[PDB]
PDB file of C-alpha atoms and ligand atoms in Angstrom:
ATOM      1  CA  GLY A   1      89.457  91.110 108.018  1.00 32.83           C
ATOM      2  CA  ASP A   2      92.452  93.489 108.099  1.00 31.48           C
ATOM      3  CA  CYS A   3      93.366  95.678 105.088  1.00 29.87           C
ATOM      4  CA  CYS A   4      94.967  98.931 104.358  1.00 24.94           C
ATOM      5  CA  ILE A   5      94.212 101.777 101.935  1.00 26.33           C
ATOM      6  CA  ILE A   6      97.211 102.098  99.795  1.00 25.99           C
ATOM      7  CA  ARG A   7      97.908 104.982  97.237  1.00 29.58           C
ATOM      8  CA  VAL A   8      98.925 103.662  93.770  1.00 31.17           C
ATOM      9  CA  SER A   9     100.389 106.003  90.978  1.00 31.00           C
ATOM     10  CA  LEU A  10     101.135 105.026  87.413  1.00 29.07           C
ATOM     11  CA  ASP A  11     104.730 106.107  85.720  1.00 29.34           C
ATOM     12  CA  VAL A  12     102.795 108.077  82.857  1.00 32.11           C
ATOM     13  CA  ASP A  13     101.442 111.606  82.638  1.00 32.35           C
ATOM     14  CA  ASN A  14      97.676 112.065  82.220  1.00 33.25           C
ATOM     15  CA  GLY A  15      96.956 114.122  85.072  1.00 32.90           C
ATOM     16  CA  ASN A  16      96.214 111.744  88.004  1.00 33.57           C
ATOM     17  CA  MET A  17      98.436 111.855  90.875  1.00 35.08           C
ATOM     18  CA  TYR A  18      97.260 108.480  92.685  1.00 32.74           C
ATOM     19  CA  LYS A  19      94.224 106.466  92.990  1.00 32.97           C
ATOM     20  CA  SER A  20      93.658 104.628  96.254  1.00 33.17           C
ATOM     21  CA  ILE A  21      92.934 100.771  96.412  1.00 34.13           C
ATOM     22  CA  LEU A  22      92.458  98.399  98.974  1.00 32.58           C
ATOM     23  CA  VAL A  23      94.881  95.544 100.201  1.00 32.65           C
ATOM     24  CA  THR A  24      93.404  93.031 102.183  1.00 34.86           C
ATOM     25  CA  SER A  25      95.669  90.294 104.291  1.00 34.44           C
ATOM     26  CA  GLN A  26      94.476  87.769 101.517  1.00 34.61           C
ATOM     27  CA  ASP A  27      95.971  89.785  98.467  1.00 32.66           C
ATOM     28  CA  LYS A  28      98.869  88.532  96.720  1.00 33.68           C
ATOM     29  CA  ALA A  29     100.807  90.619  94.004  1.00 30.13           C
ATOM     30  CA  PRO A  30      98.972  89.197  91.049  1.00 30.25           C
ATOM     31  CA  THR A  31      95.467  90.615  92.820  1.00 32.59           C
ATOM     32  CA  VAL A  32      96.711  93.945  93.696  1.00 32.66           C
ATOM     33  CA  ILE A  33      98.213  94.635  90.321  1.00 31.48           C
ATOM     34  CA  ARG A  34      94.893  93.870  88.419  1.00 31.05           C
ATOM     35  CA  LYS A  35      93.116  96.224  91.191  1.00 29.91           C
ATOM     36  CA  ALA A  36      95.416  98.526  90.469  1.00 28.85           C
ATOM     37  CA  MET A  37      95.248  98.270  86.931  1.00 25.53           C
ATOM     38  CA  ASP A  38      91.705  98.341  86.761  1.00 24.66           C
ATOM     39  CA  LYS A  39      91.458 101.191  88.637  1.00 24.90           C
ATOM     40  CA  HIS A  40      93.717 103.039  86.076  1.00 24.46           C
ATOM     41  CA  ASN A  41      91.887 101.317  83.284  1.00 24.30           C
ATOM     42  CA  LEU A  42      94.343  99.036  82.202  1.00 26.54           C
ATOM     43  CA  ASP A  43      91.839  96.169  81.463  1.00 26.60           C
ATOM     44  CA  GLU A  44      93.286  95.208  78.001  1.00 27.63           C
ATOM     45  CA  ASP A  45      96.888  94.830  79.553  1.00 29.44           C
ATOM     46  CA  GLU A  46      98.031  91.695  81.376  1.00 29.02           C
ATOM     47  CA  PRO A  47      99.447  92.151  85.316  1.00 28.83           C
ATOM     48  CA  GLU A  48     102.109  89.841  83.628  1.00 29.29           C
ATOM     49  CA  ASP A  49     103.907  92.879  82.322  1.00 25.99           C
ATOM     50  CA  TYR A  50     103.328  94.903  85.159  1.00 27.22           C
ATOM     51  CA  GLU A  51     105.239  95.580  88.305  1.00 29.86           C
ATOM     52  CA  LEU A  52     104.476  96.752  91.794  1.00 26.72           C
ATOM     53  CA  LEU A  53     107.006  99.184  93.847  1.00 26.32           C
ATOM     54  CA  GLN A  54     106.599 100.582  97.173  1.00 28.80           C
ATOM     55  CA  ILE A  55     107.898 104.239  97.573  1.00 28.00           C
ATOM     56  CA  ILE A  56     109.875 104.430 100.635  1.00 26.94           C
ATOM     57  CA  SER A  57     111.421 107.844  99.390  1.00 24.98           C
ATOM     58  CA  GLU A  58     112.823 109.508  96.563  1.00 24.63           C
ATOM     59  CA  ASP A  59     116.195 107.489  96.815  1.00 27.94           C
ATOM     60  CA  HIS A  60     114.534 103.914  98.182  1.00 32.89           C
ATOM     61  CA  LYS A  61     111.967 101.848  96.466  1.00 32.81           C
ATOM     62  CA  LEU A  62     110.804  98.154  97.518  1.00 32.19           C
ATOM     63  CA  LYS A  63     110.486  95.681  94.910  1.00 30.05           C
ATOM     64  CA  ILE A  64     106.682  93.588  95.633  1.00 31.21           C
ATOM     65  CA  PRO A  65     107.859  90.137  94.658  1.00 29.45           C
ATOM     66  CA  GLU A  66     105.268  88.792  92.134  1.00 28.07           C
ATOM     67  CA  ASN A  67     103.492  86.133  94.249  1.00 28.67           C
ATOM     68  CA  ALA A  68     104.167  87.665  97.663  1.00 26.14           C
ATOM     69  CA  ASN A  69     101.658  88.853  99.875  1.00 25.85           C
ATOM     70  CA  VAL A  70     101.396  92.802  99.596  1.00 23.64           C
ATOM     71  CA  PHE A  71     100.004  93.022 103.247  1.00 25.45           C
ATOM     72  CA  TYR A  72     102.685  91.297 104.928  1.00 25.05           C
ATOM     73  CA  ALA A  73     105.522  92.231 102.074  1.00 26.07           C
ATOM     74  CA  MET A  74     104.878  95.822 102.009  1.00 28.32           C
ATOM     75  CA  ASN A  75     106.687  98.372 104.728  1.00 25.74           C
ATOM     76  CA  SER A  76     103.865  99.062 106.772  1.00 23.77           C
ATOM     77  CA  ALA A  77     106.184 101.510 108.940  1.00 24.65           C
ATOM     78  CA  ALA A  78     106.941 103.495 105.644  1.00 24.32           C
ATOM     79  CA  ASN A  79     104.408 105.298 103.443  1.00 25.27           C
ATOM     80  CA  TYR A  80     101.724 103.410 101.536  1.00 24.23           C
ATOM     81  CA  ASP A  81     102.736 105.351  98.208  1.00 26.14           C
ATOM     82  CA  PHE A  82     102.996 102.453  95.389  1.00 24.63           C
ATOM     83  CA  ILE A  83     103.812 103.003  91.927  1.00 21.13           C
ATOM     84  CA  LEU A  84     102.447 100.411  88.986  1.00 20.98           C
ATOM     85  CA  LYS A  85     104.622 100.277  86.235  1.00 20.16           C
ATOM     86  CA  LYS A  86     105.687  98.020  83.502  1.00 23.35           C
ATOM     87  CA  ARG A  87     108.433  95.192  84.327  1.00 21.46           C
TER      88      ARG A  87
ATOM     89  CA  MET B   1     101.257 130.539  89.262  1.00 22.59           C
ATOM     90  CA  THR B   2      98.871 130.373  92.192  1.00 20.15           C
ATOM     91  CA  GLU B   3      97.902 126.554  93.039  1.00 20.12           C
ATOM     92  CA  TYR B   4      94.326 125.930  94.046  1.00 20.95           C
ATOM     93  CA  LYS B   5      93.065 122.658  96.242  1.00 25.53           C
ATOM     94  CA  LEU B   6      89.743 122.029  94.991  1.00 26.67           C
ATOM     95  CA  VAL B   7      87.803 119.313  96.858  1.00 28.23           C
ATOM     96  CA  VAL B   8      84.544 117.295  95.374  1.00 29.10           C
ATOM     97  CA  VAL B   9      82.459 115.784  97.632  1.00 28.36           C
ATOM     98  CA  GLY B  10      79.031 114.297  97.793  1.00 28.64           C
ATOM     99  CA  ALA B  11      77.014 111.093  98.098  1.00 30.08           C
ATOM    100  CA  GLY B  12      78.092 108.097  96.439  1.00 32.27           C
ATOM    101  CA  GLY B  13      77.216 107.818  92.949  1.00 35.32           C
ATOM    102  CA  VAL B  14      76.145 111.164  92.155  1.00 38.16           C
ATOM    103  CA  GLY B  15      79.057 111.527  89.564  1.00 37.59           C
ATOM    104  CA  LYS B  16      82.036 112.981  91.664  1.00 35.83           C
ATOM    105  CA  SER B  17      84.467 111.000  89.759  1.00 37.39           C
ATOM    106  CA  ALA B  18      82.921 111.236  86.487  1.00 38.47           C
ATOM    107  CA  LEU B  19      83.070 115.160  86.715  1.00 40.84           C
ATOM    108  CA  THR B  20      86.778 115.246  87.675  1.00 39.98           C
ATOM    109  CA  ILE B  21      87.636 112.779  85.061  1.00 42.37           C
ATOM    110  CA  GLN B  22      85.397 115.037  82.673  1.00 39.72           C
ATOM    111  CA  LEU B  23      87.652 118.124  83.292  1.00 36.83           C
ATOM    112  CA  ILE B  24      91.558 116.524  84.262  1.00 36.49           C
ATOM    113  CA  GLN B  25      91.104 113.887  81.270  1.00 40.82           C
ATOM    114  CA  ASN B  26      88.321 115.218  79.120  1.00 38.24           C
ATOM    115  CA  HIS B  27      86.461 112.208  78.703  1.00 39.13           C
ATOM    116  CA  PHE B  28      83.553 109.845  80.036  1.00 38.44           C
ATOM    117  CA  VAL B  29      83.110 106.376  80.268  1.00 39.35           C
ATOM    118  CA  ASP B  30      80.030 104.730  82.037  1.00 39.65           C
ATOM    119  CA  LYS B  31      81.713 102.336  84.549  1.00 35.84           C
ATOM    120  CA  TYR B  32      80.777 101.276  88.175  1.00 34.23           C
ATOM    121  CA  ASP B  33      84.143 102.034  90.610  1.00 33.84           C
ATOM    122  CA  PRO B  34      83.468 103.475  94.000  1.00 34.23           C
ATOM    123  CA  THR B  35      86.221 105.906  95.072  1.00 36.35           C
ATOM    124  CA  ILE B  36      88.006 105.480  98.405  1.00 34.03           C
ATOM    125  CA  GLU B  37      90.359 108.758  97.615  1.00 37.45           C
ATOM    126  CA  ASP B  38      91.800 110.008  94.141  1.00 39.08           C
ATOM    127  CA  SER B  39      94.030 112.810  93.558  1.00 42.04           C
ATOM    128  CA  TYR B  40      94.345 114.812  90.358  1.00 43.35           C
ATOM    129  CA  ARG B  41      96.510 117.735  89.203  1.00 42.50           C
ATOM    130  CA  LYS B  42      96.474 119.888  85.935  1.00 44.76           C
ATOM    131  CA  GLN B  43      97.820 123.271  84.970  1.00 45.03           C
ATOM    132  CA  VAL B  44      95.244 125.605  83.203  1.00 41.28           C
ATOM    133  CA  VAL B  45      94.065 129.010  82.286  1.00 39.19           C
ATOM    134  CA  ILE B  46      91.243 130.666  83.974  1.00 39.16           C
ATOM    135  CA  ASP B  47      90.599 134.495  83.420  1.00 38.08           C
ATOM    136  CA  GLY B  48      93.755 135.129  81.556  1.00 40.81           C
ATOM    137  CA  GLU B  49      96.093 133.454  84.106  1.00 38.83           C
ATOM    138  CA  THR B  50      97.678 129.856  84.328  1.00 36.89           C
ATOM    139  CA  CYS B  51      97.209 128.025  87.635  1.00 37.65           C
ATOM    140  CA  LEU B  52      97.606 124.738  89.121  1.00 42.25           C
ATOM    141  CA  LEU B  53      94.664 122.771  89.843  1.00 42.74           C
ATOM    142  CA  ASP B  54      94.673 120.246  92.486  1.00 43.05           C
ATOM    143  CA  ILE B  55      91.688 118.029  92.719  1.00 41.13           C
ATOM    144  CA  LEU B  56      90.818 115.730  95.597  1.00 40.13           C
ATOM    145  CA  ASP B  57      88.041 113.302  94.454  1.00 41.25           C
ATOM    146  CA  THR B  58      86.495 111.646  97.537  1.00 41.91           C
ATOM    147  CA  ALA B  59      84.562 108.953  98.589  1.00 39.02           C
ATOM    148  CA  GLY B  60      80.725 109.191  98.461  1.00 36.75           C
ATOM    149  CA  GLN B  61      80.575 105.970 100.857  1.00 41.02           C
ATOM    150  CA  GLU B  62      80.093 106.369 104.416  1.00 43.44           C
ATOM    151  CA  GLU B  63      82.660 103.415 104.698  1.00 43.48           C
ATOM    152  CA  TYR B  64      85.573 106.299 104.121  1.00 44.92           C
ATOM    153  CA  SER B  65      84.057 109.077 106.177  1.00 43.97           C
ATOM    154  CA  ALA B  66      86.853 109.269 109.100  1.00 42.40           C
ATOM    155  CA  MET B  67      89.220 110.907 106.020  1.00 45.11           C
ATOM    156  CA  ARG B  68      86.495 113.901 105.912  1.00 45.21           C
ATOM    157  CA  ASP B  69      88.152 115.752 108.746  1.00 45.61           C
ATOM    158  CA  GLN B  70      91.549 115.665 107.335  1.00 46.81           C
ATOM    159  CA  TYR B  71      91.035 116.904 103.673  1.00 47.61           C
ATOM    160  CA  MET B  72      88.080 119.395 104.827  1.00 45.18           C
ATOM    161  CA  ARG B  73      90.667 121.146 106.820  1.00 45.07           C
ATOM    162  CA  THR B  74      93.437 121.326 103.830  1.00 45.81           C
ATOM    163  CA  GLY B  75      90.951 121.625 101.198  1.00 44.19           C
ATOM    164  CA  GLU B  76      90.487 125.494  99.742  1.00 45.76           C
ATOM    165  CA  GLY B  77      87.117 125.131  97.862  1.00 46.73           C
ATOM    166  CA  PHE B  78      84.754 122.212  97.768  1.00 44.62           C
ATOM    167  CA  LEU B  79      82.413 121.154  94.720  1.00 44.51           C
ATOM    168  CA  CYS B  80      79.412 119.887  96.729  1.00 41.12           C
ATOM    169  CA  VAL B  81      77.608 117.682  94.114  1.00 42.38           C
ATOM    170  CA  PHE B  82      74.301 115.918  94.060  1.00 42.17           C
ATOM    171  CA  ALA B  83      72.231 113.981  91.132  1.00 42.20           C
ATOM    172  CA  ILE B  84      69.259 115.661  90.132  1.00 43.94           C
ATOM    173  CA  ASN B  85      67.445 112.312  89.916  1.00 42.17           C
ATOM    174  CA  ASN B  86      68.739 111.376  93.643  1.00 45.88           C
ATOM    175  CA  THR B  87      66.472 113.238  96.168  1.00 49.30           C
ATOM    176  CA  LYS B  88      68.384 111.582  98.946  1.00 50.86           C
ATOM    177  CA  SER B  89      71.867 112.874  97.540  1.00 51.35           C
ATOM    178  CA  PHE B  90      70.469 116.134  97.378  1.00 56.19           C
ATOM    179  CA  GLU B  91      69.257 116.165 101.256  1.00 56.33           C
ATOM    180  CA  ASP B  92      72.966 114.775 102.027  1.00 56.24           C
ATOM    181  CA  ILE B  93      74.450 117.960 100.575  1.00 51.51           C
ATOM    182  CA  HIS B  94      73.260 119.700 103.520  1.00 50.38           C
ATOM    183  CA  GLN B  95      75.129 117.427 105.704  1.00 51.99           C
ATOM    184  CA  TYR B  96      78.479 118.131 103.815  1.00 51.44           C
ATOM    185  CA  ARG B  97      77.919 121.903 104.101  1.00 52.95           C
ATOM    186  CA  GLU B  98      77.713 122.019 107.682  1.00 50.52           C
ATOM    187  CA  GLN B  99      80.552 119.458 108.310  1.00 52.13           C
ATOM    188  CA  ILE B 100      83.022 121.849 106.293  1.00 52.92           C
ATOM    189  CA  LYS B 101      82.092 125.009 108.114  1.00 52.37           C
ATOM    190  CA  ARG B 102      82.359 122.794 111.591  1.00 54.28           C
ATOM    191  CA  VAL B 103      85.412 121.416 110.726  1.00 55.93           C
ATOM    192  CA  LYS B 104      87.179 124.597 109.190  1.00 54.90           C
ATOM    193  CA  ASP B 105      85.240 126.933 111.453  1.00 56.53           C
ATOM    194  CA  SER B 106      84.535 129.439 109.167  1.00 53.98           C
ATOM    195  CA  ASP B 107      81.449 130.927 108.023  1.00 52.72           C
ATOM    196  CA  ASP B 108      82.550 131.757 104.491  1.00 55.05           C
ATOM    197  CA  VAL B 109      84.216 128.346 102.764  1.00 56.25           C
ATOM    198  CA  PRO B 110      84.704 128.687  98.853  1.00 57.63           C
ATOM    199  CA  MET B 111      81.895 126.321  97.836  1.00 57.27           C
ATOM    200  CA  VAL B 112      79.638 125.622  94.716  1.00 59.78           C
ATOM    201  CA  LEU B 113      76.598 123.437  94.685  1.00 61.07           C
ATOM    202  CA  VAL B 114      76.469 121.330  91.740  1.00 62.70           C
ATOM    203  CA  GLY B 115      73.320 119.382  90.388  1.00 63.42           C
ATOM    204  CA  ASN B 116      74.811 116.390  88.013  1.00 61.35           C
ATOM    205  CA  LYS B 117      73.579 114.345  85.498  1.00 62.56           C
ATOM    206  CA  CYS B 118      71.333 117.229  84.067  1.00 63.50           C
ATOM    207  CA  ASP B 119      71.287 115.058  81.159  1.00 68.16           C
ATOM    208  CA  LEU B 120      68.782 112.526  82.344  1.00 71.32           C
ATOM    209  CA  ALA B 121      65.178 113.164  82.017  1.00 72.40           C
ATOM    210  CA  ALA B 122      64.140 111.574  85.157  1.00 73.29           C
ATOM    211  CA  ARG B 123      64.569 114.339  87.277  1.00 74.35           C
ATOM    212  CA  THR B 124      63.614 114.151  90.884  1.00 74.86           C
ATOM    213  CA  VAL B 125      65.182 117.372  92.462  1.00 73.76           C
ATOM    214  CA  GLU B 126      63.863 120.740  90.721  1.00 73.08           C
ATOM    215  CA  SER B 127      66.211 123.433  89.998  1.00 73.34           C
ATOM    216  CA  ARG B 128      64.101 125.893  91.745  1.00 71.66           C
ATOM    217  CA  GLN B 129      64.732 124.071  95.122  1.00 76.54           C
ATOM    218  CA  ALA B 130      68.335 123.649  94.657  1.00 78.55           C
ATOM    219  CA  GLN B 131      69.085 127.442  93.671  1.00 77.77           C
ATOM    220  CA  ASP B 132      67.130 128.418  96.562  1.00 77.76           C
ATOM    221  CA  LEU B 133      69.489 126.328  98.698  1.00 80.00           C
ATOM    222  CA  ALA B 134      72.482 127.708  97.045  1.00 79.68           C
ATOM    223  CA  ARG B 135      71.095 131.137  97.585  1.00 77.82           C
ATOM    224  CA  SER B 136      70.484 130.228 101.405  1.00 78.81           C
ATOM    225  CA  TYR B 137      74.078 129.173 101.538  1.00 78.44           C
ATOM    226  CA  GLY B 138      75.238 132.280  99.548  1.00 79.23           C
ATOM    227  CA  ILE B 139      76.996 130.322  96.986  1.00 83.21           C
ATOM    228  CA  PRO B 140      76.473 129.462  93.499  1.00 81.62           C
ATOM    229  CA  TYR B 141      74.123 126.825  91.794  1.00 80.81           C
ATOM    230  CA  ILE B 142      75.407 125.260  88.448  1.00 81.59           C
ATOM    231  CA  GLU B 143      73.836 121.893  86.739  1.00 81.58           C
ATOM    232  CA  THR B 144      76.310 119.461  85.147  1.00 84.32           C
ATOM    233  CA  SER B 145      76.475 116.843  83.295  1.00 85.99           C
ATOM    234  CA  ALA B 146      79.785 114.538  83.527  1.00 85.25           C
ATOM    235  CA  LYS B 147      78.499 112.759  80.314  1.00 84.18           C
ATOM    236  CA  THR B 148      77.734 115.259  78.006  1.00 84.28           C
ATOM    237  CA  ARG B 149      80.463 117.848  79.800  1.00 84.69           C
ATOM    238  CA  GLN B 150      77.539 120.316  80.108  1.00 81.91           C
ATOM    239  CA  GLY B 151      78.577 122.988  83.050  1.00 80.36           C
ATOM    240  CA  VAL B 152      81.740 120.603  83.784  1.00 80.66           C
ATOM    241  CA  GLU B 153      84.431 123.638  83.214  1.00 79.43           C
ATOM    242  CA  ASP B 154      81.915 126.204  84.656  1.00 80.61           C
ATOM    243  CA  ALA B 155      81.384 124.325  87.906  1.00 79.14           C
ATOM    244  CA  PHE B 156      85.091 123.986  88.567  1.00 78.58           C
ATOM    245  CA  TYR B 157      86.251 127.552  87.295  1.00 78.57           C
ATOM    246  CA  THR B 158      83.440 129.242  89.429  1.00 76.56           C
ATOM    247  CA  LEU B 159      85.031 127.288  92.574  1.00 76.80           C
ATOM    248  CA  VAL B 160      88.637 128.471  91.448  1.00 77.83           C
ATOM    249  CA  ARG B 161      87.347 132.095  91.099  1.00 80.45           C
ATOM    250  CA  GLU B 162      85.349 131.644  94.560  1.00 80.27           C
ATOM    251  CA  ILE B 163      88.687 130.765  96.003  1.00 76.30           C
ATOM    252  CA  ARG B 164      90.620 133.622  94.595  1.00 79.56           C
ATOM    253  CA  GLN B 165      87.904 135.926  95.747  1.00 85.64           C
ATOM    254  CA  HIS B 166      88.243 134.483  99.573  1.00 83.02           C
ATOM    255  CA  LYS B 167      92.006 134.499  99.072  1.00 84.31           C
TER     256      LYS B 167
HETATM  257  N1  GNP C   1      73.905 109.859  82.674  1.00 87.88           N
HETATM  258  C1  GNP C   1      74.866 110.179  83.379  1.00 87.88           C
HETATM  259  N2  GNP C   1      75.504 109.464  84.275  1.00 87.88           N
HETATM  260  C2  GNP C   1      76.460 110.036  85.010  1.00 87.88           C
HETATM  261  C3  GNP C   1      76.581 111.187  85.098  1.00 87.88           C
HETATM  262  N3  GNP C   1      78.013 111.350  86.191  1.00 87.88           N
HETATM  263  C4  GNP C   1      78.286 109.934  86.321  1.00 87.88           C
HETATM  264  N4  GNP C   1      77.330 109.109  85.894  1.00 87.88           N
HETATM  265  C5  GNP C   1      77.374 107.577  86.417  1.00 87.88           C
HETATM  266  O1  GNP C   1      77.040 107.874  87.237  1.00 87.88           O
HETATM  267  C6  GNP C   1      77.682 106.459  87.971  1.00 87.88           C
HETATM  268  C7  GNP C   1      78.688 106.836  89.000  1.00 87.88           C
HETATM  269  O2  GNP C   1      79.260 107.717  89.068  1.00 87.88           O
HETATM  270  P1  GNP C   1      80.642 108.103  89.656  1.00 87.88           P
HETATM  271  O3  GNP C   1      81.489 108.954  88.996  1.00 87.88           O
HETATM  272  O4  GNP C   1      81.289 106.998  89.653  1.00 87.88           O
HETATM  273  O5  GNP C   1      80.099 108.533  90.914  1.00 87.88           O
HETATM  274  P2  GNP C   1      81.129 108.902  92.541  1.00 87.88           P
HETATM  275  O6  GNP C   1      80.221 109.981  92.857  1.00 87.88           O
HETATM  276  O7  GNP C   1      82.121 109.250  91.653  1.00 87.88           O
HETATM  277  N5  GNP C   1      80.727 107.797  93.204  1.00 87.88           N
HETATM  278  P3  GNP C   1      81.766 107.333  94.777  1.00 87.88           P
HETATM  279  O8  GNP C   1      81.478 108.385  95.605  1.00 87.88           O
HETATM  280  O9  GNP C   1      81.124 105.748  95.529  1.00 87.88           O
HETATM  281  O10 GNP C   1      83.467 107.485  94.676  1.00 87.88           O
HETATM  282  C8  GNP C   1      78.402 105.855  86.874  1.00 87.88           C
HETATM  283  O11 GNP C   1      77.839 104.710  85.860  1.00 87.88           O
HETATM  284  C9  GNP C   1      78.659 107.068  86.165  1.00 87.88           C
HETATM  285  O12 GNP C   1      78.994 106.910  84.857  1.00 87.88           O
HETATM  286  C10 GNP C   1      76.266 112.132  84.657  1.00 87.88           C
HETATM  287  O13 GNP C   1      76.433 113.489  84.436  1.00 87.88           O
HETATM  288  N6  GNP C   1      75.431 111.804  83.419  1.00 87.88           N
HETATM  289 MG1   MG C   2      83.662 106.930  91.808  1.00 87.92          MG
END
């Protein structure tokens, strides 16, 4: 039942810095993207047009493959800061 | 432009997120969505002076209680929220207060007791017992409604002024 708390930010400017969600070891990219979208109230939109990037730093960003297991794909030794944006 | 780090605390479902979102994004949508930890920021004018408001919207669920120590240490002011139709949340608010004082180790932490959901007729917590509790705590008591936006600005701005008075 492994999982981690990650911070997801939106590429917009609406007053929110980030919103935390849970990433279980069963979570594939489509699952986390829909979870992030809902959390940020993007229920109308489709997870297809969305991309998930891990912010390692201001110069480094890890692109999470569309069908990858986020729990195992993300850099666990880095910041659990992610950005949800349109592909 | 001075920055203020506000923290919204209280039992689950009392309206912490609703309150925060009402202030920051000026809207209310009835939705079930338990918080782990969300962060907001908005520049706003309070008493003829622009300042930066950092708002940490915390989890009411006991599942994420281990995070309390960390945010209580960094937080400068706390909005202690409870719902007027939830007696248990009113009782829980005592625990938050004592925990904040314990972690920060101070007898004068900027706080504001908030009685949310004052729009609901089914009141189970009288304003009198809440005011007396706030009086004993020596902090202000403000009844709010994240739905109608009643007292929302007052609650957050009063906490800001409280922090300013302390700092
Ligand atoms: N009538 C009414 N409903 C409210 C008010 N504030 C919040 N609610 C409703 O109460 C429910 C829970 O509110 P929410 O803001 O999610 O509570 P929370 O304290 O943030 N929950 P959590 O601790 O799990 O993060 C939601 O359906 C919300 O719309 C209010 O002032 N009036
Ligand atoms: Mg919530």
